[PDB]
Design an enzyme around this catalytic site. Structure first.
Site, PDB file in Angstrom:
ATOM      1  N   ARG A  47     -26.796 -21.108  13.995  1.00 45.98           N
ATOM      2  CA  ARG A  47     -27.830 -21.929  13.510  1.00 45.98           C
ATOM      3  C   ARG A  47     -29.128 -21.364  12.796  1.00 45.98           C
ATOM      4  O   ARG A  47     -29.437 -20.258  13.469  1.00 45.98           O
ATOM      5  CB  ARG A  47     -28.293 -23.192  14.333  1.00 45.98           C
ATOM      6  CG  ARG A  47     -26.984 -24.028  14.959  1.00 45.98           C
ATOM      7  CD  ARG A  47     -27.774 -25.257  15.781  1.00 45.98           C
ATOM      8  NE  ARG A  47     -26.632 -25.949  16.316  1.00 45.98           N
ATOM      9  CZ  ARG A  47     -26.040 -26.943  15.624  1.00 45.98           C
ATOM     10  NH1 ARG A  47     -26.332 -26.976  14.201  1.00 45.98           N
ATOM     11  NH2 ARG A  47     -25.084 -27.774  16.143  1.00 45.98           N
ATOM     12  N   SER A  56     -23.097 -25.167  23.818  1.00 41.63           N
ATOM     13  CA  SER A  56     -22.784 -24.882  22.461  1.00 41.63           C
ATOM     14  C   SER A  56     -23.168 -23.480  22.067  1.00 41.63           C
ATOM     15  O   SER A  56     -22.654 -23.015  21.196  1.00 41.63           O
ATOM     16  CB  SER A  56     -22.685 -25.835  21.268  1.00 41.63           C
ATOM     17  OG  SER A  56     -21.751 -26.824  21.405  1.00 41.63           O
ATOM     18  N   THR A  90     -22.677 -42.136  28.998  1.00 42.41           N
ATOM     19  CA  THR A  90     -23.049 -40.582  29.603  1.00 42.41           C
ATOM     20  C   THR A  90     -22.397 -40.419  31.073  1.00 42.41           C
ATOM     21  O   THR A  90     -21.644 -39.553  31.207  1.00 42.41           O
ATOM     22  CB  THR A  90     -24.464 -40.771  29.732  1.00 42.41           C
ATOM     23  OG1 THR A  90     -24.942 -40.722  28.012  1.00 42.41           O
ATOM     24  CG2 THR A  90     -24.890 -39.007  30.016  1.00 42.41           C
ATOM     25  N   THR A 109     -28.373 -23.602  19.923  1.00 41.14           N
ATOM     26  CA  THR A 109     -28.789 -24.747  20.723  1.00 41.14           C
ATOM     27  C   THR A 109     -27.598 -25.038  21.655  1.00 41.14           C
ATOM     28  O   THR A 109     -26.315 -24.968  21.180  1.00 41.14           O
ATOM     29  CB  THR A 109     -29.452 -26.084  20.120  1.00 41.14           C
ATOM     30  OG1 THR A 109     -28.283 -26.366  19.100  1.00 41.14           O
ATOM     31  CG2 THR A 109     -30.662 -25.767  19.484  1.00 41.14           C
ATOM     32  N   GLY A 110     -27.744 -25.540  22.671  1.00 43.17           N
ATOM     33  CA  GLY A 110     -26.687 -25.908  23.550  1.00 43.17           C
ATOM     34  C   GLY A 110     -27.070 -27.350  24.260  1.00 43.17           C
ATOM     35  O   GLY A 110     -28.120 -27.343  24.858  1.00 43.17           O
ATOM     36  N   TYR A 122     -20.745 -32.036  12.567  1.00 36.34           N
ATOM     37  CA  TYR A 122     -20.393 -31.233  13.578  1.00 36.34           C
ATOM     38  C   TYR A 122     -19.366 -31.746  14.310  1.00 36.34           C
ATOM     39  O   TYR A 122     -18.892 -32.958  14.830  1.00 36.34           O
ATOM     40  CB  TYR A 122     -21.551 -31.394  14.735  1.00 36.34           C
ATOM     41  CG  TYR A 122     -21.412 -30.822  16.052  1.00 36.34           C
ATOM     42  CD1 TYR A 122     -21.585 -29.555  16.143  1.00 36.34           C
ATOM     43  CD2 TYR A 122     -20.815 -31.230  17.301  1.00 36.34           C
ATOM     44  CE1 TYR A 122     -21.235 -28.599  17.128  1.00 36.34           C
ATOM     45  CE2 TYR A 122     -20.419 -30.550  18.396  1.00 36.34           C
ATOM     46  CZ  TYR A 122     -20.691 -29.323  18.478  1.00 36.34           C
ATOM     47  OH  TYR A 122     -20.624 -28.488  19.215  1.00 36.34           O
ATOM     48  N   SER A 123     -18.302 -30.871  15.068  1.00 36.04           N
ATOM     49  CA  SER A 123     -17.247 -31.428  15.865  1.00 36.04           C
ATOM     50  C   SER A 123     -16.791 -30.206  16.854  1.00 36.04           C
ATOM     51  O   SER A 123     -16.646 -29.290  16.335  1.00 36.04           O
ATOM     52  CB  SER A 123     -15.993 -31.588  14.804  1.00 36.04           C
ATOM     53  OG  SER A 123     -15.078 -32.070  15.556  1.00 36.04           O
ATOM     54  N   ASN A 124     -16.738 -30.489  17.990  1.00 37.69           N
ATOM     55  CA  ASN A 124     -16.280 -29.590  18.900  1.00 37.69           C
ATOM     56  C   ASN A 124     -14.990 -29.390  18.675  1.00 37.69           C
ATOM     57  O   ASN A 124     -14.456 -28.025  18.963  1.00 37.69           O
ATOM     58  CB  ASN A 124     -16.334 -30.390  20.450  1.00 37.69           C
ATOM     59  CG  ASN A 124     -17.742 -30.307  21.125  1.00 37.69           C
ATOM     60  OD1 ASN A 124     -18.395 -29.260  21.086  1.00 37.69           O
ATOM     61  ND2 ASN A 124     -18.126 -31.064  21.254  1.00 37.69           N
TER      62      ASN A 124
HETATM   63  C1  LIG Z   1     -24.464 -30.611  18.589  1.00 39.60           C
HETATM   64  C2  LIG Z   1     -25.096 -30.663  20.057  1.00 39.60           C
HETATM   65  C3  LIG Z   1     -26.088 -31.311  20.240  1.00 39.60           C
HETATM   66  S1  LIG Z   1     -23.783 -31.449  20.972  1.00 39.60           S
HETATM   67  C4  LIG Z   1     -22.664 -30.216  20.994  1.00 39.60           C
HETATM   68  C5  LIG Z   1     -22.033 -29.860  22.378  1.00 39.60           C
HETATM   69  N1  LIG Z   1     -22.149 -30.552  23.480  1.00 39.60           N
HETATM   70  C6  LIG Z   1     -21.338 -31.738  23.444  1.00 39.60           C
HETATM   71  O1  LIG Z   1     -20.687 -31.971  22.613  1.00 39.60           O
HETATM   72  C7  LIG Z   1     -21.684 -32.711  24.673  1.00 39.60           C
HETATM   73  C8  LIG Z   1     -21.978 -34.069  24.139  1.00 39.60           C
HETATM   74  C9  LIG Z   1     -22.302 -35.023  25.388  1.00 39.60           C
HETATM   75  C10 LIG Z   1     -23.459 -34.644  25.891  1.00 39.60           C
HETATM   76  C11 LIG Z   1     -24.173 -35.741  27.082  1.00 39.60           C
HETATM   77  N2  LIG Z   1     -24.649 -36.782  26.179  1.00 39.60           N
HETATM   78  C12 LIG Z   1     -23.723 -37.957  26.292  1.00 39.60           C
HETATM   79  O2  LIG Z   1     -23.041 -38.142  27.179  1.00 39.60           O
HETATM   80  C13 LIG Z   1     -24.180 -39.414  25.284  1.00 39.60           C
HETATM   81  N3  LIG Z   1     -23.697 -40.384  25.773  1.00 39.60           N
HETATM   82  C14 LIG Z   1     -25.503 -35.206  27.396  1.00 39.60           C
HETATM   83  O3  LIG Z   1     -26.688 -35.389  26.982  1.00 39.60           O
HETATM   84  O4  LIG Z   1     -25.376 -34.385  28.571  1.00 39.60           O
HETATM   85  C15 LIG Z   1     -23.123 -28.752  22.435  1.00 39.60           C
HETATM   86  O5  LIG Z   1     -23.812 -28.020  23.235  1.00 39.60           O
HETATM   87  N4  LIG Z   1     -23.543 -28.989  20.966  1.00 39.60           N
HETATM   88  C16 LIG Z   1     -24.901 -29.373  20.844  1.00 39.60           C
HETATM   89  C17 LIG Z   1     -25.591 -28.227  19.648  1.00 39.60           C
HETATM   90  O6  LIG Z   1     -24.853 -27.633  19.021  1.00 39.60           O
HETATM   91  O7  LIG Z   1     -27.007 -28.246  19.951  1.00 39.60           O
END
Ligand SMILES: CC1(C)S[C@@H]2[C@H](NC(=O)CCCC[C@H](NC(=O)C[NH3+])C(=O)[O-])C(=O)N2[C@H]1C(=O)[O-]
Length: 345
Positions: free
Chosen positions: A283, A60, A121, A297-298, A157-159
Protein backbone atom coordinates in the site's frame (compact mmCIF):
# COMPACT_ATOMS: atom_id res chain seq x y z
CA UNK A 1 12.34 14.28 6.94
CA UNK A 2 10.93 16.37 9.78
CA UNK A 3 11.63 15.11 13.35
CA UNK A 4 9.10 12.53 14.62
CA UNK A 5 6.69 14.10 17.10
CA UNK A 6 6.57 12.02 20.30
CA UNK A 7 4.04 14.31 22.03
CA UNK A 8 1.75 13.82 19.02
CA UNK A 9 2.34 10.04 19.09
CA UNK A 10 1.49 10.01 22.85
CA UNK A 11 -1.76 11.89 22.11
CA UNK A 12 -2.74 9.39 19.35
CA UNK A 13 -2.31 6.42 21.76
CA UNK A 14 -4.23 8.21 24.53
CA UNK A 15 -7.08 8.97 22.07
CA UNK A 16 -7.19 5.29 20.96
CA UNK A 17 -7.56 4.16 24.58
CA UNK A 18 -10.38 6.70 25.09
CA UNK A 19 -12.13 5.18 22.04
CA UNK A 20 -11.98 1.57 23.31
CA UNK A 21 -8.48 0.13 22.65
CA UNK A 22 -7.27 -1.68 25.83
CA UNK A 23 -3.72 -0.93 24.74
CA UNK A 24 -1.93 0.92 21.92
CA UNK A 25 1.75 1.27 21.04
CA UNK A 26 4.14 2.53 18.36
CA UNK A 27 7.82 2.13 17.40
CA UNK A 28 9.70 4.40 15.00
CA UNK A 29 13.13 3.54 13.66
CA UNK A 30 14.38 6.97 12.51
CA UNK A 31 17.64 6.25 10.70
CA UNK A 32 19.13 4.52 13.75
CA UNK A 33 17.40 6.52 16.53
CA UNK A 34 14.50 4.68 18.15
CA UNK A 35 11.22 6.14 19.32
CA UNK A 36 8.96 3.86 21.42
CA UNK A 37 5.68 4.59 23.18
CA UNK A 38 2.92 2.46 24.68
CA UNK A 39 -0.17 3.04 26.79
CA UNK A 40 -2.65 0.66 28.44
CA UNK A 41 -2.85 -3.09 28.81
CA UNK A 42 -1.84 -6.23 26.93
CA UNK A 43 -4.26 -8.27 29.06
CA UNK A 44 -7.26 -6.32 30.34
CA UNK A 45 -8.30 -9.03 32.82
CA UNK A 46 -4.88 -9.39 34.53
CA UNK A 47 -3.93 -5.72 33.98
CA UNK A 48 -0.50 -6.57 32.50
CA UNK A 49 0.80 -3.48 30.68
CA UNK A 50 1.33 -3.43 26.92
CA UNK A 51 4.85 -2.77 25.67
CA UNK A 52 6.49 -2.31 22.24
CA UNK A 53 8.17 -5.74 22.58
CA UNK A 54 4.86 -7.61 22.81
CA UNK A 55 4.19 -9.96 19.91
CA UNK A 56 0.88 -9.65 18.01
CA UNK A 57 -1.08 -10.80 14.96
CA UNK A 58 -0.28 -8.57 11.95
CA UNK A 59 -3.28 -9.54 9.76
CA UNK A 60 -3.03 -8.45 6.10
CA UNK A 61 0.51 -7.15 6.60
CA UNK A 62 1.11 -10.86 5.85
CA UNK A 63 0.36 -10.07 2.19
CA UNK A 64 3.61 -8.12 1.88
CA UNK A 65 5.49 -11.25 3.06
CA UNK A 66 3.61 -13.37 0.48
CA UNK A 67 4.30 -10.83 -2.26
CA UNK A 68 8.04 -10.74 -1.47
CA UNK A 69 8.20 -14.54 -1.83
CA UNK A 70 6.28 -14.44 -5.16
CA UNK A 71 8.48 -11.60 -6.55
CA UNK A 72 11.63 -13.62 -5.65
CA UNK A 73 10.06 -16.49 -7.65
CA UNK A 74 9.66 -14.02 -10.58
CA UNK A 75 13.36 -13.13 -10.19
CA UNK A 76 14.17 -16.88 -10.29
CA UNK A 77 12.18 -17.43 -13.51
CA UNK A 78 9.54 -19.60 -11.85
CA UNK A 79 6.60 -17.18 -12.19
CA UNK A 80 5.47 -14.69 -14.83
CA UNK A 81 3.28 -11.92 -13.45
CA UNK A 82 1.27 -11.63 -16.71
CA UNK A 83 0.54 -15.36 -17.08
CA UNK A 84 -2.85 -16.80 -16.12
CA UNK A 85 -3.32 -18.13 -12.63
CA UNK A 86 -4.61 -21.36 -14.21
CA UNK A 87 -1.28 -21.85 -16.00
CA UNK A 88 0.18 -22.68 -12.58
CA UNK A 89 -2.93 -23.98 -10.76
CA UNK A 90 -4.82 -25.82 -13.52
CA UNK A 91 -8.56 -25.69 -13.33
CA UNK A 92 -8.55 -23.42 -10.25
CA UNK A 93 -10.53 -20.48 -11.54
CA UNK A 94 -13.54 -20.47 -13.91
CA UNK A 95 -11.82 -17.54 -15.80
CA UNK A 96 -8.51 -18.63 -17.35
CA UNK A 97 -8.19 -14.92 -18.16
CA UNK A 98 -7.32 -13.82 -14.58
CA UNK A 99 -3.59 -13.27 -14.22
CA UNK A 100 -1.06 -13.36 -11.34
CA UNK A 101 -0.56 -9.58 -11.49
CA UNK A 102 -4.32 -9.04 -11.25
CA UNK A 103 -4.60 -11.21 -8.08
CA UNK A 104 -1.58 -9.53 -6.46
CA UNK A 105 -3.05 -6.05 -7.01
CA UNK A 106 -6.71 -6.83 -6.14
CA UNK A 107 -7.86 -6.36 -9.72
CA UNK A 108 -9.13 -9.94 -10.29
CA UNK A 109 -12.86 -9.55 -9.49
CA UNK A 110 -12.82 -12.67 -7.25
CA UNK A 111 -15.45 -12.41 -4.55
CA UNK A 112 -14.14 -11.97 -0.98
CA UNK A 113 -15.44 -15.05 0.94
CA UNK A 114 -14.83 -13.29 4.29
CA UNK A 115 -17.83 -11.00 3.55
CA UNK A 116 -19.92 -14.15 4.09
CA UNK A 117 -18.00 -15.21 7.23
CA UNK A 118 -18.05 -11.96 9.19
CA UNK A 119 -21.44 -10.37 8.40
CA UNK A 120 -21.92 -10.63 12.17
CA UNK A 121 -18.61 -9.87 13.97
CA UNK A 122 -18.58 -12.06 17.09
CA UNK A 123 -20.71 -14.95 15.75
CA UNK A 124 -18.51 -15.11 12.63
CA UNK A 125 -15.33 -15.12 14.79
CA UNK A 126 -16.78 -17.91 16.96
CA UNK A 127 -17.61 -19.82 13.74
CA UNK A 128 -14.10 -19.75 12.20
CA UNK A 129 -11.67 -19.38 15.18
CA UNK A 130 -11.09 -23.11 15.72
CA UNK A 131 -11.59 -24.25 12.10
CA UNK A 132 -8.86 -25.51 9.82
CA UNK A 133 -9.37 -24.83 6.10
CA UNK A 134 -7.39 -25.98 3.09
CA UNK A 135 -6.47 -23.34 0.52
CA UNK A 136 -8.86 -25.01 -1.92
CA UNK A 137 -11.70 -24.81 0.67
CA UNK A 138 -11.37 -21.01 0.70
CA UNK A 139 -11.24 -20.70 -3.10
CA UNK A 140 -14.35 -22.86 -3.40
CA UNK A 141 -16.15 -20.50 -0.92
CA UNK A 142 -15.27 -17.52 -3.15
CA UNK A 143 -16.41 -19.27 -6.31
CA UNK A 144 -19.94 -19.82 -4.89
CA UNK A 145 -20.30 -16.16 -5.99
CA UNK A 146 -19.76 -14.80 -9.47
CA UNK A 147 -16.93 -12.30 -10.02
CA UNK A 148 -17.73 -8.73 -9.16
CA UNK A 149 -16.04 -7.10 -12.17
CA UNK A 150 -14.00 -7.74 -15.29
CA UNK A 151 -10.39 -8.84 -14.72
CA UNK A 152 -8.04 -5.93 -14.55
CA UNK A 153 -11.05 -3.56 -14.26
CA UNK A 154 -11.08 -1.94 -10.75
CA UNK A 155 -9.38 -2.22 -7.32
CA UNK A 156 -11.63 -4.52 -5.20
CA UNK A 157 -10.04 -5.94 -2.07
CA UNK A 158 -10.41 -9.66 -1.65
CA UNK A 159 -8.72 -12.11 0.71
CA UNK A 160 -9.26 -14.73 -2.03
CA UNK A 161 -6.44 -13.03 -4.00
CA UNK A 162 -3.81 -13.83 -1.38
CA UNK A 163 -5.21 -17.32 -0.78
CA UNK A 164 -4.33 -17.78 -4.49
CA UNK A 165 -0.91 -16.30 -3.68
CA UNK A 166 -0.29 -18.95 -0.98
CA UNK A 167 -1.35 -21.74 -3.34
CA UNK A 168 1.06 -20.43 -5.95
CA UNK A 169 3.93 -20.34 -3.45
CA UNK A 170 3.34 -23.91 -2.28
CA UNK A 171 2.77 -25.33 -5.80
CA UNK A 172 5.80 -23.70 -7.37
CA UNK A 173 8.27 -24.32 -4.52
CA UNK A 174 7.06 -27.73 -3.25
CA UNK A 175 7.29 -26.22 0.26
CA UNK A 176 4.91 -24.84 2.83
CA UNK A 177 4.47 -21.07 3.08
CA UNK A 178 5.97 -21.25 6.59
CA UNK A 179 9.20 -22.77 5.19
CA UNK A 180 9.40 -20.18 2.37
CA UNK A 181 8.78 -17.23 4.76
CA UNK A 182 11.44 -18.60 7.13
CA UNK A 183 14.09 -19.27 4.51
CA UNK A 184 13.55 -16.20 2.29
CA UNK A 185 12.65 -13.55 4.89
CA UNK A 186 12.62 -14.40 8.62
CA UNK A 187 16.06 -16.02 8.86
CA UNK A 188 17.98 -13.63 6.47
CA UNK A 189 16.62 -10.55 8.29
CA UNK A 190 16.96 -12.19 11.76
CA UNK A 191 13.25 -11.54 12.59
CA UNK A 192 13.41 -13.29 16.02
CA UNK A 193 9.86 -12.21 16.95
CA UNK A 194 8.24 -13.26 13.65
CA UNK A 195 6.38 -16.54 13.17
CA UNK A 196 3.93 -18.39 10.93
CA UNK A 197 2.51 -21.21 13.11
CA UNK A 198 -0.83 -21.96 11.36
CA UNK A 199 -2.97 -23.75 12.41
CA UNK A 200 -1.58 -23.44 15.95
CA UNK A 201 -3.61 -21.04 18.12
CA UNK A 202 -0.82 -20.14 20.60
CA UNK A 203 1.17 -16.93 20.16
CA UNK A 204 4.80 -17.79 21.11
CA UNK A 205 6.33 -15.77 23.90
CA UNK A 206 5.05 -12.61 25.61
CA UNK A 207 2.25 -11.09 23.55
CA UNK A 208 -0.59 -8.60 23.51
CA UNK A 209 -3.97 -10.26 23.86
CA UNK A 210 -6.54 -9.23 21.23
CA UNK A 211 -9.98 -7.86 22.10
CA UNK A 212 -12.76 -8.03 19.55
CA UNK A 213 -15.34 -5.24 19.79
CA UNK A 214 -18.92 -6.58 19.42
CA UNK A 215 -21.36 -5.02 16.90
CA UNK A 216 -23.59 -3.88 19.78
CA UNK A 217 -22.45 -0.51 21.06
CA UNK A 218 -21.03 -0.74 24.59
CA UNK A 219 -21.02 -4.57 24.54
CA UNK A 220 -18.40 -6.52 26.51
CA UNK A 221 -15.14 -7.22 24.68
CA UNK A 222 -14.31 -10.77 23.55
CA UNK A 223 -10.79 -12.20 24.01
CA UNK A 224 -9.89 -13.14 20.41
CA UNK A 225 -6.15 -13.80 21.01
CA UNK A 226 -6.03 -17.55 20.28
CA UNK A 227 -7.37 -18.63 16.88
CA UNK A 228 -6.09 -20.60 13.88
CA UNK A 229 -6.36 -17.66 11.43
CA UNK A 230 -6.98 -20.49 8.93
CA UNK A 231 -9.56 -18.31 7.13
CA UNK A 232 -6.65 -16.06 6.03
CA UNK A 233 -3.33 -18.10 6.00
CA UNK A 234 -1.05 -16.42 3.38
CA UNK A 235 -3.44 -13.40 3.37
CA UNK A 236 -3.23 -12.81 7.17
CA UNK A 237 -1.66 -15.30 9.65
CA UNK A 238 1.86 -13.89 10.42
CA UNK A 239 2.83 -13.04 14.03
CA UNK A 240 5.45 -10.31 14.57
CA UNK A 241 6.62 -7.33 16.61
CA UNK A 242 7.05 -3.60 15.98
CA UNK A 243 10.83 -3.97 15.73
CA UNK A 244 10.59 -6.80 13.21
CA UNK A 245 7.99 -5.14 10.93
CA UNK A 246 10.20 -1.98 10.96
CA UNK A 247 13.18 -4.14 9.95
CA UNK A 248 11.16 -5.87 7.21
CA UNK A 249 9.68 -2.78 5.47
CA UNK A 250 13.03 -0.94 5.75
CA UNK A 251 14.75 -3.88 4.07
CA UNK A 252 12.05 -4.00 1.37
CA UNK A 253 12.13 -0.30 0.45
CA UNK A 254 15.93 -0.09 0.61
CA UNK A 255 16.19 -2.85 -2.03
CA UNK A 256 17.38 -5.86 0.02
CA UNK A 257 14.62 -8.42 -0.74
CA UNK A 258 14.35 -8.61 -4.59
CA UNK A 259 15.78 -7.20 -7.81
CA UNK A 260 15.26 -3.50 -8.60
CA UNK A 261 13.03 -4.58 -11.54
CA UNK A 262 10.68 -6.53 -9.23
CA UNK A 263 10.58 -3.79 -6.61
CA UNK A 264 9.52 -1.40 -9.42
CA UNK A 265 6.68 -3.77 -10.41
CA UNK A 266 5.65 -3.96 -6.72
CA UNK A 267 5.27 -0.17 -6.71
CA UNK A 268 3.14 0.24 -9.86
CA UNK A 269 0.14 1.86 -8.18
CA UNK A 270 -3.51 1.04 -8.76
CA UNK A 271 -5.76 3.80 -7.41
CA UNK A 272 -7.59 2.96 -4.16
CA UNK A 273 -8.79 6.53 -3.38
CA UNK A 274 -7.41 10.09 -3.80
CA UNK A 275 -4.74 9.51 -1.10
CA UNK A 276 -3.99 5.78 -1.49
CA UNK A 277 -2.69 3.29 -4.02
CA UNK A 278 -2.18 -0.49 -4.15
CA UNK A 279 0.86 -2.08 -5.85
CA UNK A 280 1.64 -5.79 -5.56
CA UNK A 281 1.02 -6.69 -1.94
CA UNK A 282 1.94 -3.18 -0.91
CA UNK A 283 0.00 0.00 0.00
CA UNK A 284 0.90 3.62 -0.58
CA UNK A 285 -0.53 6.29 1.74
CA UNK A 286 -0.19 10.03 0.95
CA UNK A 287 0.29 12.10 4.12
CA UNK A 288 -0.91 15.66 4.73
CA UNK A 289 2.56 17.17 4.53
CA UNK A 290 3.17 15.92 1.01
CA UNK A 291 5.07 12.75 2.00
CA UNK A 292 4.09 9.26 0.69
CA UNK A 293 4.88 6.12 2.74
CA UNK A 294 4.80 2.45 1.78
CA UNK A 295 3.84 -0.69 3.64
CA UNK A 296 0.60 -2.30 4.75
CA UNK A 297 -2.27 -2.21 7.21
CA UNK A 298 -3.74 -5.23 9.00
CA UNK A 299 -7.05 -6.14 10.61
CA UNK A 300 -7.41 -9.53 12.34
CA UNK A 301 -9.85 -10.04 15.25
CA UNK A 302 -8.56 -8.01 18.15
CA UNK A 303 -5.61 -6.35 16.38
CA UNK A 304 -5.19 -3.26 14.16
CA UNK A 305 -1.72 -2.80 12.63
CA UNK A 306 -0.07 -0.03 10.59
CA UNK A 307 3.46 -0.72 9.27
CA UNK A 308 4.95 1.82 6.81
CA UNK A 309 8.36 3.12 5.71
CA UNK A 310 9.68 6.05 3.71
CA UNK A 311 10.59 5.51 0.04
CA UNK A 312 14.26 4.83 0.84
CA UNK A 313 13.50 2.69 3.97
CA UNK A 314 15.42 5.02 6.30
CA UNK A 315 12.41 5.79 8.56
CA UNK A 316 9.91 3.05 9.47
CA UNK A 317 6.93 3.05 11.79
CA UNK A 318 4.80 0.23 13.24
CA UNK A 319 1.70 0.92 15.36
CA UNK A 320 -0.63 -1.61 17.05
CA UNK A 321 -3.91 -1.30 18.92
CA UNK A 322 -5.21 -4.55 20.50
CA UNK A 323 -8.83 -4.15 19.49
CA UNK A 324 -10.72 -4.45 16.20
CA UNK A 325 -14.24 -3.78 14.83
CA UNK A 326 -13.78 -0.24 16.14
CA UNK A 327 -13.45 2.17 13.23
CA UNK A 328 -12.76 5.16 15.50
CA UNK A 329 -9.66 3.32 16.86
CA UNK A 330 -8.64 2.30 13.34
CA UNK A 331 -8.86 5.88 12.05
CA UNK A 332 -7.07 7.29 15.13
CA UNK A 333 -4.16 4.86 14.82
CA UNK A 334 -3.55 6.08 11.22
CA UNK A 335 -2.55 9.41 12.76
CA UNK A 336 0.68 7.77 14.04
CA UNK A 337 1.92 8.06 10.43
CA UNK A 338 1.34 11.84 10.46
CA UNK A 339 3.13 12.34 13.75
CA UNK A 340 6.01 9.99 12.92
CA UNK A 341 6.69 11.25 9.34
CA UNK A 342 5.29 14.80 9.14
CA UNK A 343 6.23 15.79 12.72
CA UNK A 344 4.91 18.73 14.72
CA UNK A 345 2.68 21.07 12.82
C1 LIG B 1 -8.67 -4.48 3.91
C2 LIG B 1 -8.69 -4.75 5.42
C3 LIG B 1 -9.18 -3.56 6.26
S1 LIG B 1 -9.74 -6.17 5.91
C4 LIG B 1 -8.46 -7.33 5.30
C5 LIG B 1 -8.00 -8.51 6.18
N1 LIG B 1 -8.85 -8.80 7.34
C6 LIG B 1 -10.06 -9.36 7.09
O1 LIG B 1 -10.39 -9.66 5.97
C7 LIG B 1 -10.89 -9.60 8.33
C8 LIG B 1 -12.29 -8.98 8.17
C9 LIG B 1 -13.13 -9.05 9.47
C10 LIG B 1 -12.48 -8.13 10.51
C11 LIG B 1 -13.42 -7.96 11.72
N2 LIG B 1 -14.62 -7.27 11.26
C12 LIG B 1 -15.84 -7.81 11.22
O2 LIG B 1 -16.06 -8.92 11.65
C13 LIG B 1 -16.89 -6.96 10.56
N3 LIG B 1 -18.20 -7.59 10.87
C14 LIG B 1 -12.64 -7.24 12.81
O3 LIG B 1 -12.74 -5.82 12.73
O4 LIG B 1 -11.99 -7.86 13.60
C15 LIG B 1 -6.92 -7.57 6.64
O5 LIG B 1 -6.02 -7.54 7.46
N4 LIG B 1 -7.22 -6.63 5.64
C16 LIG B 1 -7.27 -5.17 5.94
C17 LIG B 1 -6.20 -4.36 5.25
O6 LIG B 1 -5.59 -4.72 4.26
O7 LIG B 1 -6.00 -3.22 5.95
Amino acid sequence: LPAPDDTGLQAVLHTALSQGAPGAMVRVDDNGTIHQLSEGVADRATGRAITTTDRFRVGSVTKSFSAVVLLQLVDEGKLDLDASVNTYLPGLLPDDRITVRQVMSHRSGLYDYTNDMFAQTVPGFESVRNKVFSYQDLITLSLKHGVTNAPGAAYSYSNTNFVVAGMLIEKLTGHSVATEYQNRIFTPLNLTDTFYVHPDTVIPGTHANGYLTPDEAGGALVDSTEQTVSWAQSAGAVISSTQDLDTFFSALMSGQLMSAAQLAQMQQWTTVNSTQGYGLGLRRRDLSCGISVYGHTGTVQGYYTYAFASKDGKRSVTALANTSNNVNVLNTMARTLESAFCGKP
